[PDB]
Amino acid sequence: VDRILKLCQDIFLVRETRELELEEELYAKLIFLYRSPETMIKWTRERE
Amino acid sequence: KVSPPSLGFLAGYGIVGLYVSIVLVVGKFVRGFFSEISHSIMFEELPCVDRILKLCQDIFLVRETRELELEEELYAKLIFLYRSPETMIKWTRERE
Amino acid sequence: RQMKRIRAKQEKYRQSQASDHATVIHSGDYFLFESDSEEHMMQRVLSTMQFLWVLGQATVDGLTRWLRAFTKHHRTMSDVLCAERYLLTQELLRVGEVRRGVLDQLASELLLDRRLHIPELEEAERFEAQQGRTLRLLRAGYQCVAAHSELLCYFIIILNHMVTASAASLVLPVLVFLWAMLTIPRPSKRFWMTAIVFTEVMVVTKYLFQFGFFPWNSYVVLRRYENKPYFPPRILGLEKTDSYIKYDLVQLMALFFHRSQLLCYGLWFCVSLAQSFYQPLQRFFHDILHTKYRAATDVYALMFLADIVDIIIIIFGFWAFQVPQAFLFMLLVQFGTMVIDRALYLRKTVLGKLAFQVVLVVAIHIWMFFILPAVTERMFSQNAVAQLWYFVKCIYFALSAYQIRCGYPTRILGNFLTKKYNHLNLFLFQGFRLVPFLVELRAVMDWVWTDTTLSLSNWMCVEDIYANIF
Amino acid sequence: IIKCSRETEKKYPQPKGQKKKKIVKYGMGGLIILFLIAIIWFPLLFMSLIRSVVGVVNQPIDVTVTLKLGGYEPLFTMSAQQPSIVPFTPQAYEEL
C-alpha cells in the first residue's frame, strides 16, 4: 500500500499549504483508483 | 422528610447500563455513515448517468406495454453493467 | 522539497495528457497509474530469586539514570560552579588579592568545559558514588526537586488553594495562571516578591482573626454556621479552625527556597492621568508577549488528554451521587470548550488562544469558588470529585500557557498515532477508533475549520481511505 | 438521485479551485456537531431529571400513647392531634 499511503499523505500536505487546485486533482486520482479494481491490482502490486 | 415513592431502580449499575447500551448502539449506527463509505465509491461517483437512466426508463416502458421478452433482455444488460466495474467506467464516461 | 516534487509530477501529467469543478473532480483515466519509469529445586529457586533481584536492581538503576538525565543540565552546572568555588575560596581565605588570575588559573563562556582537576572533589565524588542502594536514588530525587523549584512552588500554591477555598486563598493562583506563567521564561522578580508578601500578610491576618474575642467566634455562631459555605469569615478565609494554617507554612518555605536558589544562580483630569499610567503597562505586557522570537512546540495532544480525563472525572462524580445539576452544566460547558480549543488549534491564532485562556481561567475560578458553593455545599468540605477536577483543570491551564509562550509550529495536520507503523501504534489507533463519537467529531471539525474545496462527503471518503490504508 | 445532483451541479457552476463557502460549512458542521453532542448529553439530563425527588416534610398529625399492664386493660390512653402537637420554632431548636 505504499503508493496509496503516499498519495493520501500528499493530499494532506497540499491541503495544508493552501494550493487547492492540486488537492482537487489528487482527490480525482484517488477516487478513480478506488473506482476501478483492476487498476487497484496494478497499483498495489508488490514492487520488485 | 418523605418523598413520593418514585425511587424505582437507581444508578450505580441500575440504569447506567441502559445509558451505556443506548450510547453504544447509536454510536455504531452513526459510524455506519463513516466507516465503510469508500467501498461504495464505484457506484456513486458516476460522472454521467444518462445512458443508465435511459435504460431503466426503457425497462419500465417495455414492462408497461406487455412485451416481456424485451424486458428480460434489457434486465440482462443492466445486470451485466452492474456486474463489471470497468464497463461501468466506459459506459458512464462524460460524453463529448 | 515535497511541494516541488508534487508540482513537477502534476506538470508532467499535464504535458502527457496534452499529447466545471465537478468535472475536475470527475476527471481520471488509466494513464495516471501507468508506471512512469517506476515512479534439584534449590538451584532453580536460587536462579529465580537472583533473576528477580537483578531485575529490581536494573529497574531502580534505570530510574536513577533517567532522573539523572532530567537533572543533567543543573548537575553539570553545579559541578563547574563548585569546582570554581573550591578554587576561589583558598585565595579568598588567605588574603583576597586578584580576580582575573584566580579565574584564569585553570572562550570566555562554554557550556561544557574541561580543565585541571583537584583531588578533593573527585575524592568526594566517588565516595558518594560508592553508595548506591538507596542513597543515590534519594540524592537524585532531591536534585531533581531542587532543579525544578519553580514547578514545586506552583504546585504548592495550587494545593493550598485546593484546600481552604476562599478569596484570600484564591487571588494567588489567578496571578499564577495569568501573570506568572506568561511573562518571559523567568517570571519577574516582582511576582515572587508579591507572592512572598501576600502569603506573609495572609498568615498574619489569619492569626489575628483566629482570636476568640471577635464576635464572629462565640462557640454559638460558629456551631450553627458549621457547614454553611457563605459564612463571611469562611468566604474570606478568616474563619477560625484548629488547623487554621493548611499548607501555608509549606508555601512560604517553598517560596523562600526558590528565591534563595535563584539568588545563588542568576539575576534578581486626575482619572485620565491615572489610567494612562496604568493601562499602558498592561498593553506593553500583552504586546511583548504577542510579538517575540520563541522556540515553537506542540502540546495539543496532552491538553486534549487532560480534558478527556476531566470528563471522566465529572462522570464518575455524577455516578457517585444538588451537585448533579451542576455536574451536567460543567459537562456541557466542557464539551463546548473542547470544541473551541480544537478550532483555535486548527486556525493557529495565538491571540485567540490567549483570549480564550484568560476568559476560561477567570470564569472557571469564579464559577467553582462562588456560584457552586451558593447552589450546593462547601467545595472543600466534601466533593473530592470537585477538587480532583480542579486539579486536572489546573494542569490543563499550565499546558495551555506553555503552548502560548512557545507558540504554534508549522505542519500541525496529521494524527499523532500515524507517525510510526509500530505494533503499539496500531493498537492505539484501533483503540482510539473504537471509542464512540471521536472519529465523527474529529472529521467534522477538521472539515469545518480547515479550508478546502471538498464537500463533507468527499472529505469523509478521504479520511476513511486513509484510516484503512494505515 | 445522482442525476438530480448532476443537474444541480450543471446549473450553478463553481469557480475552478476555490474555498468552500464559510457560511455553508458553518451551518452544516454546527448542525452535525450540535446533534452529536446532544446525543451524548441529553440522556444524562433525562436520567438526572426523572430522579429529582424533593423531600416533603411529614409531621405526625396524631400521637397516641397507651400504658397497659399485663393483659388486663390499658390503664392509660391519651391521643393528641391538632393543638397539642407543637412544631418546633427556630428559637426552640436553638435551645435544644
Ligand SMILES: CCCCCCCCCCCCCCCCC[C@@H](O)O[C@H](CO[C@H](O)CCCCCCCCCCCCCCC)COP(=O)(O)OCC[N+](C)(C)C
Ligand atoms: C486579606 C487581604 C490582604 C490584602 C493585602 C494586599 C497586598 C497585595 C500586595 C502584597 C504586597 C506588595 C508586594 C509588592 C512588592 C513589589 C516591590 C518589591 O519587588 O520590592 C521588594 C522589596 O520589598 C520589601 O523588602 C518588603 C515590602 C513589604 C511590603 C509590605 C506591605 C504590607 C501590606 C499590608 C496590607 C494589609 C491589609 C489588611 C486588610 C485587612 C524587592 O526586594 P529585594 O530588594 O529583592 O530584597 C532584597 C532583600 N535584602 C535587602 C535582604 C537583600
Ligand SMILES: CCCCCCCCCCCCCCCCC[C@@H](O)O[C@H](CO[C@H](O)CCCCCCCCCCCCCCC)COP(=O)(O)OCC[N+](C)(C)C
Ligand atoms: C520518591 C521517594 C521519597 C522522597 C521524595 C522527595 C521527598 C522530599 C522531602 C522534603 C525535602 C526537603 C529539602 C529541604 C532543602 C533545604 C534547602 C535549604 O537549606 O536551602 C537554604 C535555605 O533556604 C531557605 O531557608 C528557604 C527555606 C527552606 C527551609 C528548609 C528547612 C529544612 C531543614 C532541614 C534540617 C535537617 C537537619 C538534620 C539534622 C541536623 C538556602 O540554600 P543553601 O543551603 O545556602 O544552598 C543552596 C544550594 N545547595 C542546596 C545546592 C547547596
Ligand SMILES: CCCCCCCCCCCCCCCCC[C@@H](O)O[C@H](CO[C@H](O)CCCCCCCCCCCCCCC)COP(=O)(O)OCC[N+](C)(C)C
Ligand atoms: C478580604 C480579601 C482581600 C483580598 C485582597 C486581594 C488583593 C489583590 C491585589 C491584586 C493586585 C494585582 C497587581 C498586578 C501587578 C502587576 C505589576 C505590573 O508591573 O505588571 C505588568 C503587567 O501586569 C499584568 O498584566 C498583570 C495582569 C493581571 C490580570 C488579573 C485579572 C484578574 C481579574 C479578576 C476579576 C474578579 C471579578 C470578581 C467579581 C466582580 C508586568 O510587569 P513585569 O513584567 O513584572 O515587570 C516589572 C519590572 N519592570 C517593570 C522593571 C520590568
Ligand SMILES: CCCCCCCCCCCCCCCCC[C@@H](O)O[C@H](CO[C@H](O)CCCCCCCCCCCCCCC)COP(=O)(O)OCC[N+](C)(C)C
Ligand atoms: C484519576 C486520574 C488522574 C490521572 C491524572 C493524569 C492527567 C494527565 C494530563 C496530561 C499530563 C501532561 C504532562 C505534560 C508534561 C510537560 C511536557 C513539557 O513539554 O512541558 C513543559 C512545560 O509545560 C508545563 O510546565 C507542564 C504542565 C505541568 C505538568 C504537571 C503534571 C504533574 C504530573 C504528576 C505525575 C504523578 C505521577 C504519579 C505516578 C505514581 C516544558 O518543559 P519545561 O518544564 O518548561 O522546562 C524544560 C526542562 N526539561 C527540558 C529538562 C524538561
Ligand SMILES: CCCCCCCCCCCCCCCCC[C@@H](O)O[C@H](CO[C@H](O)CCCCCCCCCCCCCCC)COP(=O)(O)OCC[N+](C)(C)C
Ligand atoms: C452545545 C454546546 C456548544 C454550543 C455552541 C457554542 C460553542 C461553539 C464554539 C465553536 C468554536 C468557536 C471558535 C471561535 C474562533 C476561534 C478561531 C478564530 O480564528 O476564529 C476567527 C473568527 O471566526 C469567525 O468569527 C467565524 C465564527 C466563529 C464562531 C463560530 C460561531 C458559529 C458556531 C460554531 C460552533 C458550533 C458549536 C456547536 C456545539 C454543539 C477566524 O479568523 P482567523 O482567520 O483565525 O483570524 C486570525 C486572527 N488573528 C490574527 C488574531 C489570529
Ligand SMILES: CCCCCCCCCCCCCCCCC[C@@H](O)O[C@H](CO[C@H](O)CCCCCCCCCCCCCCC)COP(=O)(O)OCC[N+](C)(C)C
Ligand atoms: C439538539 C438539536 C439539534 C438540532 C435539531 C435536530 C437537527 C437534525 C439532526 C441533524 C441533521 C443532520 C443533517 C445532515 C444532512 C446531510 C446532507 C448531505 O447531503 O450532506 C453531505 C454530508 O452528509 C453526511 O452524510 C453526514 C454523515 C452523518 C449523517 C448522520 C448524522 C445526522 C443524522 C440526522 C437524523 C435526524 C433525525 C431527526 C428526527 C426528528 C454533504 O453534502 P453533499 O451530498 O456533498 O451535497 C451534494 C450537492 N448539493 C449540495 C447540491 C446537494
Ligand SMILES: CCCCCCCC/C=C\CCCCCCCC(=O)O[C@H](COC(=O)CCCCCCC/C=C/CCCCCCCC)COP(=O)(O)OCCN
Ligand atoms: C465514560 C466513558 C466515556 C468515554 C471514555 C473514553 C476514555 C478513553 C481514554 C483515552 C482516550 C484518549 C485518546 C483520544 C485522544 C486524541 C488526542 C488528540 O490528538 O486530540 C485530537 C482530538 O480529536 C478532536 O479534535 C475531536 C475531539 C474533540 C471534540 C470533543 C467532542 C466532545 C467530547 C466527546 C467525548 C466522548 C463522549 C462519550 C465518551 C466517549 C469518549 C470520551 C485528535 O487528534 P489530532 O488533533 O488529529 O492530533 C493532532 C496531533 N498534533
